[model samples]
Target: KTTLFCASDAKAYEKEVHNVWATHACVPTDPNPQEMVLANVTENFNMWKNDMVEQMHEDIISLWDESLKPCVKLTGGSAITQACPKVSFDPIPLHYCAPAGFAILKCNNKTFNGTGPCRNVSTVQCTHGIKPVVSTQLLLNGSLAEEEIIIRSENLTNNAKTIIVHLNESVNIVCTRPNNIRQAHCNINESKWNNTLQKVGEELAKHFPSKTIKFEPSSGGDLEITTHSFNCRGEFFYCNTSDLFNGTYRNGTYNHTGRSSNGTITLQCKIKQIINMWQEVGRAIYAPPIEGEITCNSNITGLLLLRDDTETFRPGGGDMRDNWRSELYKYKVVE
Candidate 1:
């Protein structure tokens, strides 16, 4: 006689032939339930959720040739006049609804009823009330009608209940894309952009340091003016003290500056004075402005000097109430 295995009725035979004898408690979850009779499926549910279900979803979806965009119809007392709210913006995937029926019964397996375009209830053949187009990944398990399998998988029944509600009514509430999902989707654009952003950020961080340049005011309270070639490195200006004890206009100096790892430093000032002469009567006549000499720092390299300006000075001494001061500072840097 040929042995026929009716799984529902074969419990005693399976226990006799397939039971694991010992050491079954250590295995996380049963590869074969008969081989690990004492194992609790619930205890290993998290492992299945994080490692098994997620990876399986990812792998299967990646390889799936195409995904479905569901369109649904509603069956009820009257056709709904309300429009199906759009939900393509959801992070959850959209899917297509296909015919799912079991061998023993005539039942339509309406999985994704109101997910995307299928939200319109009147589109479906059944007429009752509100129906939604549901979106999901199509996973066909058996050739039999879905009604029979639903009792065996309570999870499917639960999902169906929620999916049905979501299908019929779409909240009019609009939402901007969430940053988390947006960033995840953007990362999919390229594998290397992440590294490139880091490289640029690191390089830029090297250039900025909190350091100030220092300078002193000259004796005459004069404007420190000069024309010279600059350096490849950039430059800046700061004043040590622009106040002098005299009321002369010749009391300021400017020096070149630039940045270094230790912070910005400067080249020494090259000083020159074009002496002016006054008549014995002390009345100014044919006065000429003095010329100061300076040069581009020989060590300067790596950048270009765009422009430069000088400072004006005033002093509070003699009959003049204005005291000496320097208006401009100086700086230089390497390429």
Candidate 2:
């Protein structure tokens, strides 16, 4: 057992920065259950995300020179904590879907060989794709770090598969039991996020450009940072002229005109243009570390409006209700 002593809680917290902190899988107790372990991990992860977001917000202060600090504090950018939702899922069946069907595979830059919805997929393919795609990949840390997880009662004893996931400077692993059930592992190795960090860092560095533009968040303000980038207008010219036919082949009436191509291709082109323009506008709209909040209410209003100009019968019979008038169906939960 060890005890830590510090001048104050703040100092102790700062000291933890240099100390090793491990997010453990299970506590060795009478009933070392998996659910408890998962709960602890999930809580730790949410806190980690919130704290990191706040730390980044605070650090943005130092990004600019002191002369620019006042303006930055007043206008540079602001961040709000986005509470992550409680994620829960029931146990689902797992199958083996890998190349050789063993457990792990390490191919170089090649595509996966699994099949089915996920056939020719990894051994861990379930109904859904993969969990925590971005964060899971982040924890892995290496250029190649994705795994398929399977849980079995017998497999928790020892390590059969040892894969190193390289996250920034962190090395983590997920151990499997003989039946293929295990826990997550993480460690620190001195590897600079050389390329990854540089790319993200460079983008943030561009935020405080030499010249400043009037920037504000609210739509009511004249200095709304989010502004339009492109003024796109479309024009089309079409012609259809054929030699006299129908009844004879001599001279015949020919109509030549243009219509807006209201089809998939036009839709795709417009979408592409819109995305490109937004990316350009992002140069001004984006704040460093690019963070935001999200809210979800399960008590959301859901509506199902049925109109069967196609339905065989109408709610008020095919008379007045049968009139092609619009209709709305509303449902309210009783207290």
Candidate 3:
């Protein structure tokens, strides 16, 4: 019983800024029904993997001050319609693996305790992991105000998780679904990214400085701003390391407590960085659970891929051959 009046529809018609957004999940869905499994699912398993492989690939913009404006847009998921609210929102957990003994079928009814194959889903568009990454939008507002900016979400622990953004004011990143949920919960984090931090052959990575706002996204340009913001090179290393608790993070294998490094710990780094981020601009757009697009069942799970020593069975159950989070980023030439 409400209406959303963001930027005019015509405003979004032109694909200006494409902010890249990313989300993670625990278990996966299955498109091939249980009945179908009893019939031909196993028989067509290999054929079904083609859909998964093509997806195991591929992986935004803003409004600002002097050069442009910084804004946020959501896409690749179902577009919803609604007004902004003050109450904080928590997305429905649709793909999370079930609790022990509850049997999340896909995990072979195994107990991940929050770590395992399910926890390795931070890498976007790679078969080794699972992520819901896309570049689409439901709310596109251009008339931004300085008195607005903030974004927060809860993790599996229900502990509040906030992203360090670039705005002066504050607001929340909220979305809603009208009881149209299929599965119950998905994932909140992963641990395998530590593996990506190995850097060269011998040295452990110098932990990424911190995950926060560096650039602002507002007014945009004709070309997508596909530039490297954070560079992962030389001694100064990794962002997705074993976290701040890691031994060689800030110390670069020297293990100095970053917060209170015992003493002198040399730290120099480089990596790809960008302004593809989320902020509480001024308005809220209608963002529905992309997981809401397809209805899934607890019993409806299937094989996602099969390789020697492992036969992955936790996807496309709800017609979801793939899942992604679209973060649109727009680049403008500073005149």
Candidate 4:
């Protein structure tokens, strides 16, 4: 008793099997992403994925060939029975489920579709033949796409989250995931850049010595000045005892002589007959209109000085004032 299987049914079976294979490779959803991963974890997934993809093609071919086999009666029995070979394309436990209505009452077998087709099976003509395109590798096209994968992976892995690590540097053994359905995605490259960033941490502690330093934009942001180097002098003048006793620049120093000149001052007796009568004067700082001596710490900085200004005698009271009394203070102002 010979019976048949449809090519459409065989094609349908092959497609569903291919779909399962696609999920096996695609929908794993990066099991060891972000938080946890292992050397074996992804490796294990790839071998499984690759091996399973290989098996996918094999299984579809086997079933396609098996269903089209002419069903032959096994024994001269009262029941019209034929034995279809079981497909031994094994898969991961709980990960495999057969599609429905694989076989029907036409076969008269209690174990119909339970295993594979039985009863001398032959195929009906299908609009599209049962040639299953195995869910194989996907080579990601375009250099830009490839470039971004590298960049993002470098960012997320070489650049993004990492928790505890030691002696890690970027081996940078980067490989393109030329195939997606095979789950042949690659590895984590450890980095010295992170460790180099650790140098920023070390230098921070080295320079600052502690945490909690503040950052701001403005404080004393602008500065300027007029006096870089100066050879200028103080006021030149004459004083008398009345000036000190009054506790002011009055009576003689400023008042009697009315202060002095811009650079030099002198007191001389016009009568020239009172040598015993002394006078007092204050010789303030003087700088010649042209630079001559006394470098302004930097010779370039100060441009003026006087080579000769012999400020005359001082009295016993202090070095700040010069004195001469000539015949009851008859001295006239000299410059």
Candidate 5:
């Protein structure tokens, strides 16, 4: 009865007895299990609230409604002006999977000639999965002379998506006339208008050949006329007459009779040169008047205007002077 455990065995035996007693008394003595559970739940709720406060800081402003919408609207309504050289809007919000920061609103197959309004819509965003983005200004020339991107991507990309933003611009063909000093500007779609311009240029080249000249001349010789030369595409000659000589004048015609005065010793003629397999040369141009000289018979003072004058022949042979004065030598002057 008096024997007792001691040393290491004695200490272990004491701890085992204490655990046995506390297991029944300590755990079961709490007020309620539900109350204990409620305390833990409250502590967890406070900790979660603190964490949410730390994570979410400040009010968020919308990138779409506040920033991008107004910018798009502004670009849609207004145009480029010299007074305000270049106008810029707030940078559009960038998004993942878009080729550019901002979207584009294009015309429906219509071009902006700096003359009218804008029409439809297309979307764009950043190419890669990137964040924390910024954008730049819309680039549209006021003259609308250039095919430019109104909105484009800022940071360059690899493996980017293919984005075709249709613009209000077109290829142009300008036709110029040196004879009349006239110019015409024509607009064409990129794919459709090439053949049209080629045909147009071909026809224009025929009507206006190289080494051409243009002129306008009065009826008779020794007439005071002026000429001015500038940009000319073909040769043009103008001659004036008052029914004394009934003749026809046409393009590429050689040695055409322009004006004839029987009473006048001065005989006027128009000369057109067609060289090398009927290729015409020496065309007249359109411009102001300048001083010019043409040699005449020293015997003649000036031109004698005539009306319905016809040459008469005396059967076989009459007078040699009369024959000379007849219509045998018909001199036609043309410009």
Candidate 6:
């Protein structure tokens, strides 16, 4: 049993033991007593040294630099937490259709054989005349770090059945269709115009009194003006040919002969007029009479007139219709 002792007693006792041991150097005489004691002490010292060295080795191992370990990169460019003893990736097949069938795949640059096991492998499918649409991403953590994926297709034969492939950085595909054929039909209305021919002629005559102005009416219900070549005898009115018409009048017939062409004019005017001494009654001299054989959906073949003769209905002809002619000259609305 172990017991506590006073420091003075322990010291005195230790001194007595030391004195005894000091005098007992080779005591209890044996063949190798000293060597045996030395051997025992050396063994104890060696054991203690070995224990310290083992402890130091454990500490050094615990303080190992993590950077020295091998690392593995997975999807999304992210690194694995632990070191990888060995790595492997499986081969994947990507299928495409041009006319027959085709396939393409990509693998890591590291050493690899056709036979292996892997976590994942990427594949892309392609079709003929249709571009291969693919997407790829290079990421730092969970965010993208600018990147792209492209596929291209090519045709080797024209309408021939075969598998074709175009390896390119970017993708492209071509397609076409036959040209268009078309036909159309249409109809245009006959164009006509209206104006005040008499008023225009009166206005021109008032300005050019010396010029002989003649009004000629056309069957198409139009009026044309022709002036004779003459000099200014007094304060005569004159108009340049270019000012009157843009080009030769009446299809280059009248207004392109000589100086006479300088005074030619084509006047488009109102188809009706009036001359009444009592009331303001107007008549349409250019247009046919209102009473006529009207037809629907049929063209008029001949002229339409109230009376064939004109001078017989005059005031002195005794026809007694001139007094009421003003009433016949009245304008009526169609509707």
> Candidate 4 lDDT, tens digit per residue, 139-220?
1110111111110010112212111111112212112212111111122112322222233233323323434212111111
lDDT of 6: 0.17
Off by over 4 Å in 5: 1-101, 110-115, 126-194, 198-335
Candidate 6 Cα errors over 4 Å, as ranges = 1-43, 47-49, 72-335
TM-score for each prediction?
0.14, 0.15, 0.19, 0.13, 0.12, 0.10
Query: Where is the poorest 10-residue window by lDDT in model 3?
Result: 326-335
lDDT of 5 by residue, 1-335 (tens): 01111011112122232222223222221122111111121111111112111111110112212211111122334522222111112111111121123321222212221113323322211111111111001011111213331211111121121111112233231212212212212111322222222332233234335512111222232211111011111211111222212222223331223332332212222311111110111111222211222111111001111111111100011111111111101111111
1 versus 2: better lDDT goes to: 1
Candidate 2 local lDDT, residue 334: 11
lDDT of 6 at 327: 14
lDDT of 1 at 44: 11
Q: Per-residue CA lDDT of candidate 3, range 220-263, in tens?
A: 22111111011011000111111212223232223222232332
Instruction: Give the per-residue lDDT digits (tens) of candidate 6, residues 1-335.
Output: 11111001112123232222212321121222111011121111111112222322232222221211223323344434444222111111111111123221222212111123322232212211111111011000110111211110112122221111111121111111112111111111111000112222233344334443332211111111111111111001111211221211221122222212222232111111111101112111111112222111111111101101000000011111211111111111110
Shift in Å, residue 116, candidate 6: 55
Q: Which 10 consecutive positions of candidate 6 have the poorest summed lDDT?
A: 307-316
The per-model lDDT (C-alpha) reads 0.17, 0.16, 0.18, 0.19, 0.19, 0.17
lDDT of 4 at 136: 8
The candidate maximizing TM-score is 3
